[PDB]
Amino acid sequence: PKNPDLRIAQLRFLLSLPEHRGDAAVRDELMAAVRDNNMAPYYEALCKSLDWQIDVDLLNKMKKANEDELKRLDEELEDAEKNLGESEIRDAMMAKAEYLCRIGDKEGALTAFRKTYDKTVALGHRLDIVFYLLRIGLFYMDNDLITRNTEKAKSLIEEGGDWDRRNRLKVYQGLYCVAIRDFKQAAELFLDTVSTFTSYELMDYKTFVTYTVYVSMIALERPDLREKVIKGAEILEVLHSLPAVRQYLFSLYECRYSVFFQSLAVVEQEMKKDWLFAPHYRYYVREMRIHAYSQLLESYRSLTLGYMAEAFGVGVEFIDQELSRFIAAGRLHCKIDKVNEIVETNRPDSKNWQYQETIKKGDLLLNRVQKLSRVINM
Amino acid sequence: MSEKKQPVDLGLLEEDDEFEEFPAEDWAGLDEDEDAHVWEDNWDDDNVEDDFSNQLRAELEKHGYKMETS
Amino acid sequence: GFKQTVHKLLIVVELLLGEIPDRLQFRQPSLKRSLMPYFLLTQAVRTGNLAKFNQVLDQFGEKFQADGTYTLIIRLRHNVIKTGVRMISLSYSRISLADIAQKLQLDSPEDAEFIVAKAIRDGVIEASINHEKGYVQSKEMIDIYSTREPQLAFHQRISFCLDIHNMSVKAMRFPPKSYNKDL
Amino acid sequence: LRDDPIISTHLAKLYDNLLEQNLIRVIEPFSRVQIEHISSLIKLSKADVERKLSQMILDKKFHGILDQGEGVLIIFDEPPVDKTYEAALETIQNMSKVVDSLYNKAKKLT
Amino acid sequence: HLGSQLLRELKKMDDKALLVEVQLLESKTYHALSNLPKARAALTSARTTANAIYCPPKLQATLDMQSGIIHAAEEKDWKTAYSYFYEAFEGYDSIDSPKAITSLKYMLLC
Amino acid sequence: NYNKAVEEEDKMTPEQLAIKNVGKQDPKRHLEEHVDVLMTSNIVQCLAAMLDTVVFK
Amino acid sequence: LPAKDIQTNVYIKHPVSLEQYLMEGSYNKVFLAKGNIPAESYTFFIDILLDTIRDEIAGCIEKAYEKILFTEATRILFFNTPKKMTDYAKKRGWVLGPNNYYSFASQQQKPEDTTIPSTELAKQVIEYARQLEMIV
């Protein structure tokens, strides 16, 4: 739901895998368990928790308070029923569905948000219900269930983009677009950060900037950064919050690897132990390394091992297997030679290869017109 | 002819009868993190991932110690 | 359901050349389960560890080695070093006696240049065999035909592509005749 | 200049602007020349000059490329840009044509 | 934040001349955070607010002094910004020695 | 530029052709003009052999 | 042949191991494995096989793309008996330098004058007017 139980119950990832940080997460998880009817979530995740000595103490009170508030919402629903009104029943069934999202059961909340989803007099409250399924779909990390109601609720809006509704839907686009590895189309989503604000429902503003600084810092090149973020005053405002981000932006844009590799361990450790950002930690590292190697290797034709080793601050034995793996595996530039122990590339990728970029579509189109020949007579 | 696909589908039924929903759930433990993700990138990410699964998985935390030693 | 055989044998004969393209653009839950036992070894081909993967193959190998006569896999057991030395051909030129020889699990001066020469006599790569002080060099020029005899390079590409696209023009001329034939 | 206001970035922009004028002054007539023969006139190190130069080639303000082992400067350009753009756009736009054709025929047949 | 909460209780109340100090310093802190649009918005609000009230040269010249830095931050036109620093120097003339030496320092800068 | 300028409408043609399929309302054929464009484009092919003859002998 | 008849005798797996070593091409393992064959009387026939593949092994090691020195041919080639330097001097017919083997006619071919491929390009244009405009 929109309560802080989404984040407190969202720390279960760092509560589960590492055993070092599993103390504060169970501290504010057990302390916050008396809030927002957290019984069923932590009872489901009880295998990753402590023993049953103190566990069975509060279950008897939470299981009876759940039935008490549940039967009070049922009596209020029966009082709202059999009466002339539309928003009253939507508020009763919607509040019941919000409590069923507090307990963390999407069966009665699925049929509840289905009933109040069918009682939507307007499309705005319908999109509000869709968002009510997205706020719990983030915790449930479902793929299609959160894209179906947004695919159906996306078209036929006709009421214009609000300041927090359409912007909130764009924030959700940042969420599921950060889950997926799509970057070249997700680089346009965070451009509306001027109208964004502190949203305690899903993600704080500083967490939204901290999450978009990876897709913006890695998924964008130097002209894209200079056009979007360097020209924009938003990162100039939010860089004063943490001095590290300014180092990872001015050091990367300044091409200083001696400090970027010394400080990159904070990006390595901070990159993991996250709910939605951990399983992609392997792609950001390699993609950022090959992006920096293409950045430095773009303006440089030949490169000696002395200036390279002093520039990157690492031994030659490691960059040997680095470029050796990035010739075939990386596929960034032409073949490299070591006849003089000097990185020397040619890169004839403009004159003839600029015309040869269409031969792939010519061969695939050739197989497609061979399929067109297969359609003939049958 | 389309009639020779039947024994091959019987072989697929034998492969499905070897393990009953064991690779679907066990492999679904990673597929739940791989679902809806472009499988074209999963070949490179799985290539370097499986390549570094044996040793030097991260290696970024070790460079800080390799600076003074190399 | 049927393309898993032509695709299975396809990648099995494709990994022999050192470059093995996996399943990227096709999403169906048949070739996945068909490739699950073969995935560990088809990923183990590129790294090319002899002693470990040699035990990995026969360790859990049931069906791909129980397919019959183990011919192409018994050729693969010694083709691992040929795809690995082909990755060395895709690697830097100079060959050391300890670093890359110890890396290739082959530490001896004779069989190094002998087997590398066995990779040179194939003709799929390009090297410059020179002996000045004892080290074996190589030019390894893999530069594409860009600004290097282009007319003779893609001449047959233009002729062949115009032949296929032109018989496709016949394949868009004749079916209209088969259309207007009845009326 | 230690208590200088934020305009220090503008003063550095003037310094780098005169540096740009000198670079487009002496390098422009020199197609391939030594880095010390051309840097001896300004009697400055090649570190900051190399970083600013390579930064401005990465900014694509002019045609050029640096070097460290040999220091060879090469200047080249590719005038026919409007060919591969229109051709590639025709291929990408025709892909949808052939695919839609296979959708109409695949719809009418099976 | 506290300045915004002060604006919430100053825009409704009287004494519009007091809003010129907090909107001027608002442009100073948005310029310190390098924010051009909001500093121009607060600057324009201070202009349309202090247009009817005859402000003393301590606050009247600071509007043009900061305006020349805001316009000089994007480097649009140095003539208008030079007019803002010229009128700012005319406002800070013979009233404070550091403000005058930094006023002529800003004239020679722009 | 004219070829792509017609292909931008030929991207919208399979929708109408995928909806109605009955009757023709646009007097433009979109075919013979492109055939003429190919005829003007074949001058390079026909004169390439001419340059081959001038270069040869 | 893998009919699973015996599969434990050294003679059953001997031809496939020797042929797989032939795919590797390593001759040192065969020479060191010459004394590994049991009293089975086909060792002389194995020597006949080495006698009929020594022309291909020696022919491939003496390809001489750029150059090779005699100090490698001393170890790779056979014993000090001067049969290879005598028979190969009348078979290959190359030059013998100061204790070194020189390689000539390597990448020395001159490129074409671009005249004949222009004529066959003109013929291809004739075939393009033919096939493109034949039925008309």
Query: 3-class secondary structure for E67-87?
Result: HHHHHHHHCCCHHHHHHHHHH
How close, in Å, is residue E33 to chain A by CA atoms?
5
Is B69 a domain residue?
A: no
Q: Tell me how many domains chain B contains.
A: 1
CA nearest A72: which of A53, A42, A50, A96? Answer: A96
By CB atoms closer than 10 A (0-12, 13-18, 19+), residue F9 is exposed
Q: How far apart are CA A197 and CA G28, in angstroms?
A: 75
Is B70 a domain residue?
A: no
Q: Do A302 and D78 touch (CB under 8 A)?
A: no
Is B2 a domain residue?
A: no
Q: How far apart are CA B23 and CA C39, in angstroms?
A: 13
Please tell me whether residue G101 adopts helix, strand or coil conformation. strand
Judged by a CB distance cut-off of 8 A, whether residue B32 touches chain A is yes
Sorted by sequence, the CB contacts under 8 Å of residue E78 that are 6+ apart come out as E72, E110
Q: How far apart are CA A336 and CA A345, in angstroms?
A: 6
Q: Do F14 and D100 touch (CB under 8 A)?
A: yes
G77 DSSP 8-state letter: S
How close, in Å, is residue B6 to chain C by CA atoms?
9
How close, in Å, is residue A258 to chain B by CA atoms?
10
Count of beta carbons in the 10 Å neighbourhood of residue C163: 13
A303 DSSP 8-state letter: E
Q: How far apart are CA G85 and CA G96, in angstroms?
A: 10
Judged by a CB distance cut-off of 8 A, whether residue D17 touches chain A is no
Is B68 a domain residue?
A: no
Chain A and chain C share a number of CB contacts under 8 A equal to 56
Touch test E–A: 3 Cβ pairs or more under 8 Å = yes
Q: How far apart are CA E42 and CA E44, in angstroms?
A: 5
Chain C residues near residue A341 by CB distance under 8 angstroms: 94
Judged by a CB distance cut-off of 8 A, whether residue G131 touches chain F is no
Phi/psi for G68 (5° steps) reads -140, 145
Touch test C–G: 3 Cβ pairs or more under 8 Å = yes
Q: Do G122 and F52 touch (CB under 8 A)?
A: yes
Beta pairing, strands A342-344 & G68-69: unpaired
Q: How far apart are CA C122 and CA B59, in angstroms?
A: 38
Phi/psi for A300 (5° steps) reads -120, 125
User: Which among C23, C33, C47 has the least Cβ separation from residue B23?
Assistant: C33
Q: How far apart are CA A349 and CA A301, in angstroms?
A: 13
CA distances from A235 to D6, F5, G120 (A): 17, 41, 63
Is B1 a domain residue?
A: no
Q: Are A218 and A287 in contact (CB under 8 A)?
A: yes
Q: How far apart are CA C120 and CA C101, in angstroms?
A: 17
Interface mutation vs chain C, best among G16, G28, G62, G66, most C CBs within 10 Å = G66
Touch test G–D: 3 Cβ pairs or more under 8 Å = no
Judged by a CB distance cut-off of 8 A, whether residue E32 touches chain D is yes
Beta bridge partners of G96: G101
Q: Do D94 and A355 touch (CB under 8 A)?
A: no
Count of beta carbons in the 10 Å neighbourhood of residue A305: 17
G109 DSSP 8-state letter: P
Q: Which two tokens stand for residue A10?
A: 């969202």
Q: Which two tokens stand for residue C11?
A: 């990648």
Q: Do D93 and F17 touch (CB under 8 A)?
A: no
Q: How far apart are CA A8 and CA A22, in angstroms?
A: 13
Q: How far apart are CA C31 and CA C28, in angstroms?
A: 6
Is B24 a domain residue?
A: yes
Closest chain B residue by Cα to residue A331: B44
Q: Please, what is the Cα angle at B66 between A337 and C50, to 5 degrees?
A: 60
Touch test G–E: 3 Cβ pairs or more under 8 Å = no
Sorted by sequence, the CB contacts under 8 Å of residue B42 that are 6+ apart come out as B34
Amino acid at A31: M
Q: How far apart are CA A340 and CA D69, in angstroms?
A: 10
**Resolution, Å (one decimal):** 5.7
Q: How far apart are CA G68 and CA G106, in angstroms?
A: 13
C133 DSSP 8-state letter: S
Q: Do C2 and B5 touch (CB under 8 A)?
A: yes
Q: Do D7 and E32 touch (CB under 8 A)?
A: no
Cα–chain-centroid distance for residue G97? 24
Q: Do B70 and A285 touch (CB under 8 A)?
A: no
Greatest CA span in chain C, whole angstroms?
Answer: 83
Amino acid at C82: K
Judged by a CB distance cut-off of 8 A, whether residue G136 touches chain C is no
CA nearest A230: which of A211, A258, A259, A252? Answer: A252
Q: Do C131 and G26 touch (CB under 8 A)?
A: no
Q: Which two tokens stand for residue A367?
A: 């197989």
Q: Which residue has the tokens 């282009």?
A: C150
Phi/psi for C124 (5° steps) reads -80, -15
Sorted by sequence, the CB contacts under 8 Å of residue A166 that are 6+ apart come out as none
Cα–chain-centroid distance for residue D23? 15
Q: Are A133 and A149 in contact (CB under 8 A)?
A: yes
Is B16 a domain residue?
A: yes
Chain D residues near residue F10 by CB distance under 8 angstroms: 97
Q: How far apart are CA D95 and CA D89, in angstroms?
A: 10
Q: Do D68 and A303 touch (CB under 8 A)?
A: yes
Please tell me whether residue A68 adopts helix, strand or coil conformation. helix
Containing domain of residue B16, as a range? 7-63
Q: How many residues are listed for chain G in this entry?
A: 136
Q: How far apart are CA B25 and CA C33, in angstroms?
A: 12
How close, in Å, is residue G115 to chain F by CA atoms?
5
CA distances from A338 to A293, A318, A323, D1, D41 (A): 18, 15, 11, 48, 34
Is B37 a domain residue?
A: yes
Please tell me whether residue G69 adopts helix, strand or coil conformation. strand
Q: How far apart are CA A100 and CA A110, in angstroms?
A: 9
Could you please report the per-residue DSSP string of chain D? -TT--TTHHHHHHHHHHHHHHHHHHHTTT-SS--HHHHHTTTT--HHHHHHHHHHHHHTTSSS--B-SSS-----------HHHHHHHHHHHHHHHHHHHHHHHHHHHH-
Chain A residues near residue D95 by CB distance under 8 angstroms: 361, 365, 368
Q: Residue-wise over E21-49: b if at least 16 C-beta within 10 A, else e?
A: ebbbbbbeebbeebbeebbbebbebbeeb
Q: Please, what is the Cα angle at D69 between D63 and D74, to 5 degrees?
A: 20
Q: Are C94 and C140 in contact (CB under 8 A)?
A: no
3-state helix, strand, coil in chain A (%, to 5): 65, 0, 30
Chain C residues interacting with chain A (CB cutoff of 8 angstroms)? 87, 90-94, 137, 139-147, 150, 161, 164-165, 168, 171, 175, 178
